[PDB]
Write a protein that binds this DNA or RNA. Structure first.
Length: 76
DNA sequence: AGGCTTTGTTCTCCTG
DNA sequence: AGGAGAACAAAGCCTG
């Protein structure tokens, strides 16, 4: 068994945004989508980012509670 | 199976 | 010393 990383603010926000974007732009692939998502992300300010920042932090805390002895060991 | 693409978090290396 | 560099979370498509 090999766990995986908790989502950060950007990833949490991109779940529902990618979706809405893919609707609007069916002809686009996730590569291109991601570029548009980037710009849309940095277009937000503190207040607009806060809920996802908070959401990434509770997700983060939960990950530690779920996996106490976890340690991130990326591959080479 | 793994690349393409993004941000943010966390890892593994270390020269002068 | 701390930071450059890269992995890896999400998505779904798509050759040989």
């Amino acid at each position: 068994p090999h766990v995986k990383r908790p989502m950060n603010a950007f990833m949490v926000w991109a779940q529902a945004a990618r979706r809405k974007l893919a609707d609007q732009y069916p002809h686009l692939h996730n590569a291109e989508l991601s570029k548009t998502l980037g710009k849309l992300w940095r277009l937000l300010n503190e207040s607009e980012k806060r809920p996802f920042v908070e959401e990434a932090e509770r997700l983060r805390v939960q990950h530690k509670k779920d996996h106490p002895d976890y340690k991130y060991q990326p591959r080479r």
